[PDB]
Design a protein around this ligand. Sequence first.
Ligand code: ZN
Ligand code: ZN
Ligand code: ZN
Lengths: 98, 183, 223, 546, 79, 90, 96, 178, 30, 126
Amino acid sequence: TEGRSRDGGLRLGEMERDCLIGYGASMLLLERLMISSDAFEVDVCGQCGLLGYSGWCHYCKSSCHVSSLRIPYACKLLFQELQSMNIIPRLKLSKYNE
Amino acid sequence: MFVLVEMVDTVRIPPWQFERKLNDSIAEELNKKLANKVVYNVGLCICLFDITKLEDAYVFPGDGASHTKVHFRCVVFHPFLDEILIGKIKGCSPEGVHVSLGFFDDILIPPESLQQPAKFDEAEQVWVWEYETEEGAHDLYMDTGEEIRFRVVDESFVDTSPTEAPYTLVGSISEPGSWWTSN
Amino acid sequence: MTQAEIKLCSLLLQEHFGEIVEKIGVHLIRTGSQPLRVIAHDTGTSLDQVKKALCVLVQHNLVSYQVHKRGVVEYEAQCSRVLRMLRYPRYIYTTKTLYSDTGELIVEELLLNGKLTMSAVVKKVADRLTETMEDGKTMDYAEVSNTFVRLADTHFVQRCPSVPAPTLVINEKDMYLVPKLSLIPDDGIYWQANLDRFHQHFRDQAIVSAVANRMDQTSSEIV
Amino acid sequence: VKEQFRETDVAKKISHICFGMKSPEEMRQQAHIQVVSKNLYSQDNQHAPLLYGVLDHRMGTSEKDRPCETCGKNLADCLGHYGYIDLELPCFHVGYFRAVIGILQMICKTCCHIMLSQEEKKQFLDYLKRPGLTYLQKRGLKKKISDKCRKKNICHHCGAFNGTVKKCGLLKIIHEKYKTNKKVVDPIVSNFLQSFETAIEHNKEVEPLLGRAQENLNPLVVLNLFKRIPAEDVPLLLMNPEAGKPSDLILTRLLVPPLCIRPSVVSDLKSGTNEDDLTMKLTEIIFLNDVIKKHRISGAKTQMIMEDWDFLQLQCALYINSELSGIPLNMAPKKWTRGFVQRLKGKQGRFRGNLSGKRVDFSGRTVISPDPNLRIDEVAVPVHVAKILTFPEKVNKANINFLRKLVQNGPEVHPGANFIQQRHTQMKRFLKYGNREKMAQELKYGDIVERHLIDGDVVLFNRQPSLHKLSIMAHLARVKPHRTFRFNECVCTPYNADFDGDEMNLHLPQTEEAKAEALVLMGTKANLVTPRNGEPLIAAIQDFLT
Amino acid sequence: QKRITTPYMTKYERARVLGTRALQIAMCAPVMVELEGETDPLLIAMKELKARKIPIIIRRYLPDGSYEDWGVDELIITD
Amino acid sequence: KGEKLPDVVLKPPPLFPDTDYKPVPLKTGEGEEYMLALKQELRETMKRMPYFIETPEERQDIERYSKRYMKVYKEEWIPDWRRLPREMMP
Amino acid sequence: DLMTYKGEVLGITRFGLAKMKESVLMLASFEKTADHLFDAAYFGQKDSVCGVSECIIMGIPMNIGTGLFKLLHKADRDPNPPKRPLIFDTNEFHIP
Amino acid sequence: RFGSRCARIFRLVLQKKHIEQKQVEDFAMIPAKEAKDMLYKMLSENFMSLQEIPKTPDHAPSRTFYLYTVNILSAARMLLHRCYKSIANLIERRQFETKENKRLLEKSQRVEAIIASMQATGAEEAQLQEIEEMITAPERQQLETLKRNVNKLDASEIQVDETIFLLESYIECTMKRQ
Amino acid sequence: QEEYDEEEQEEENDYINSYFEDGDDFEATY
Amino acid sequence: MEVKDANSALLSNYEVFQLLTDLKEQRKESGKNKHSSGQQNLNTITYETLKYISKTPCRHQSPEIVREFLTALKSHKLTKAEKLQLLNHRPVTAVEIQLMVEESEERLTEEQIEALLHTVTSILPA
Ligand SMILES: [Zn+2]
Ligand SMILES: [Zn+2]
Ligand SMILES: [Zn+2]
């Protein structure tokens, strides 16, 4: 929360983020913008990119194509809030290992 | 224990287990995974046969573990249509009977067992088979039975709902077990 | 055109023709004209199978082709013509109501093979009637060709564009004559049924029925 | 019973994201529950949710007292479910208004076919199929085709004259047709007029008003006007057939978002609960939907039904934008409500307010003080702040007797831990309410322990108004009991400090692997040269020079 | 097989290798150095690099997609 | 603006709303019963026709002695490349 | 050289940035209420997540910096281990 | 679909083009409530159009003149889109029954071909009763039902297709190629 | 290219906010 | 998980028998049963499979004898699959062989069946 009377924290804007990018450090940037800010686990299907639950899709009705990812709560918030504007964000999961 | 199928998955290794051979570690981790599971269609996995080819390991930034993608062959339980197997009858129902195998514990045979079967549940589970063509035969079946040879037909595959049988087989009585064959 | 008729022709091409042919047929309805290479690329089916499907489609006068800018072949699938496969029984029955089984059987295989020669269909129906008969296994070829020339002179079975470069130019003339046949080899001439005549006859029958039930049964005869 | 094989894969990432609009049938397929009731809370003893309502617990719980229904969990382990609402009368869209008023000029209104030539259509589709197509190149092609289609008012396929398409009011489309000029008499317009002269036998006030009689396109006729368009002319209309479709542009099925996306607020001043404005607008739309159905069986005038239809179409239109201008005075609302577009726009938004900001914890800020008694990469941390901040670490074989002494000391004394986490069980326990002599004994390998900040830790120290990349640096932490920030005056030039009223802040990295990245790249000894010129920025202060 | 890439060890890869080795040591991993009593395994993660006893291979990817394998012991570490 | 029209529903509408009128039966005639069997035999001979490809999948797993039931007697028709696009060369 | 490689002299404005980059998400903060957002759903283009700002918004490790190269573990492993025979299935014994 | 009561009003508004909502009450002797209900049900299914006539440049739907008109061309062109979906549903239902009992029909046809061949060489009564005993009552009642079902469906496809020809002949007559 | 103004078109960011301290004395959380 | 071949490399029951006899023989000596559930599942599977294969009278045969039996079966006609299906059980009784082959009354004769019956009873011990 905002303010020191409500036991809140500090804000890290782009002014300091550009300085972290100029150095070339990426692990520290994701550690203190995603790990200590908002860390959430979300399940996504590869065939049809959508938000499921407990590793189970309701559009394709299949449990085979399923995976999990770490997405900040703000990103999932925006993704679930943009669905009311007649816009469906379909993600495409690619193999990072191969 | 009829067919062996090849599979491929990425298997992570704990960072403290860097003293054993990677081969046996991967084999144990993959034998622990697929022990008592049916995946979608191939059938019920029994055990792991061996790995075919072993690829390299990767260290992703942030986790510190090691991910390796290996191809392994596991023995699955998937018999063909015209196959006869023996089972020990567990219980009797008004719609067929529930006979199970050693590890696979759900077989139900439908009313299509004989030409004149009789089913009636008054107090216990009983089965009558009369046979009047040229003489009088009356075979009586009780709470427990054993050594029943039958064919598996109508193999079904159901997907489990998010948390109730993913694999189900029905059979026609071929050789009730004194031995009398029915064709 | 619209998704409904596209889905209808999908099932009509999957039930009558093969699924491999049905895929290439339904892919040719959404796109007006496309070369064969890009078609095989989009559909994803092997070249031999798409070639077989294209020959199957062009044999039933369902898909046409034209030569474009340099030498390219652009195909066009006409779904309005393929939606008339549920009236084949009505067509055969309306050929049978006035004529006899000869015309019915000569128009049965005419819409099952598309472009076909008359000397072949007459021999086919002749051997078929010989096989179904028991005592008299004799079918005059002249009696069979009489029904064909009768369909010809009253304009039920016309001639397709004959053969007059990467591709041959398709051209049609207004000379629907019947070449002199021999009964005991005439190639380059194929006949096909005219659906326009069938639609005109259906319109006349509908008008006659409407005026028959309108006021009197006698004025239908005059009209 | 046997368990089905279910395992998740981690070696996957998102590569591309394709945008697209869903159709009512897919909306219902994805939806879980259908609301039919307008009452938010049931009229029972205590506050309880109503089934098949706007505030239902089947889309996701919002509090710490009621579990979920779909999958038994809490709102922390819950994503959310959607619903579908059937609309009696189809409504227009506020963002897809320019698109539909353009499409109405593109295709005809009686034939549903593009107004182009066979040769020009081929020339255009040839330009369409190209291996390289940017988003800025398709922006101008639509306008290039629209003028070419609007130049000709008569189509070449059929022989009907369309006219033009213009908008009016706020959501109203009038097709400019049946033009009456003074050069040539048309049979169509004369038949149209004489077909109206038979209706002047009852009311004498329709003949002078007949000259302004035209075609008024309503969502109903546009619905089948979008369903009669051939699918072969869709690719040339600059519309991806895979993602979108000409049909699903009219709102027919409303998508209810999850309840976890719209939290409710409570004020402890007069026992006042206030739901989200989204929920109020949804429950207001439901009350406007059944009055049209009841008016049908009851029987009202055509104007009484058109007014309710327009009100239902306007209330859902202000639900997303809520900033539309040019609204009727009688229909103008007095209260100000924010919608989805207003959740996006604004300084207090979600794009540059939450995503870009993303404020983090485990930090502080305090006035700096001079102290030329440390090194160049050292900084003094107050004891009060060091007691608040905590660093988690896993216990190794060499970290057994180093953490046991710390947990034996306690949280009251500076060297010590506060939270203890187990190896398998993911739970944290306090060290103030429980015992410390026993926790040191029950210690195994792979246990997370959060200890207080000690000397020799990579800490980040920077000011708010950063200009260059040297405004943030990392130093070594040192505990000093003076309740103030202290650091060497040599590094005052990179921070551009004045040492009179400056308030400098400090961050503590949480991940051990990232602790090494701030020591090699964001190093005080390493960063002594400036990238712009190449001169050393840390030399001395005027006092040292003198 | 010929390497046409500079043999000098970049600081960008040095820092990531040090962080990965420190995080792996913090997971009760078999250490390959004679360490005495000291805390902060990150401090001794550099000790193994100074003695060239780090079993980590660096894979450098090219814009086209070529992979180049390099050893930490083969890289030149100069301070 | 809003008149006296409060309505509250608890049971969601039925999946299949009860219809009011039933459909009207069709006519019957010798032509109709003839065309029924005609279309049936037409579909039957279209299934067993060389134009209908019956080897897309051929998903065989275990071979047996009854090959006549697995495979079908299929022939090829005259391609007639003369009255056909010369580019297509099978 | 940044405004000289692709075409002519391009300026650093709101219109030239749309010609340089092709990401709608970064333009979402520059532009206004819903124009681009609705035209994106209308046209239906695919946004590639390969930008540093996109990696920070999404939460993916960025390419530039310390995320270009990839690490590799080294231990004892065999490329192709010996296989186990299949005594029953032999082609010479089947005569197919 | 609706009834003769509404067909009378449909033909009434077809005769008198652009009729008023207040004047349909005395022309067509129908209770006002049911008349309005049926009129709105006909408006909801897009069977006739609604024209608006204002008195000012702005709409003002409150103070405006609404009229109901009938367009047979649009109704014909829209039922031409409904008959195709009807045929599609009929074909789907006809193909749905063939895949439900395909194994049972192929196992009942296989047991008939083996006896049709042996009956040529010699038929014995016991073997003839053996085949009647083999196929059970639900195994022999499936074919009798599916035959009637597919017959009804194939007889309905022709009856819904002839309507297409009656409806596609009026669309092309107004169509003029220019 | 339209003659627009940088101030009204480009909305104020954290860049614009001039962090300066002046005397200016005298939501659901879970 | 991705599958390369579903129906391939069909093995017999004695194969998994001899694979499972020595699988747990060295596992009990080396492994100390650390994991509870992951190891108990494998133990139950192994025990049930071993009991089911021991109840079947097919464990007393060497692979050389199996190869000789396959050489004897590859001779006349029957089937690549029925060769292994007949090996899983004992064809001692003559009515059971009529159920093994779907149509054995028209394919072969009674004496050709009895000869093979004698040869397989001389092979399979009791
Ligand atoms: Zn899915
Ligand atoms: Zn839930
Ligand atoms: Zn037109």
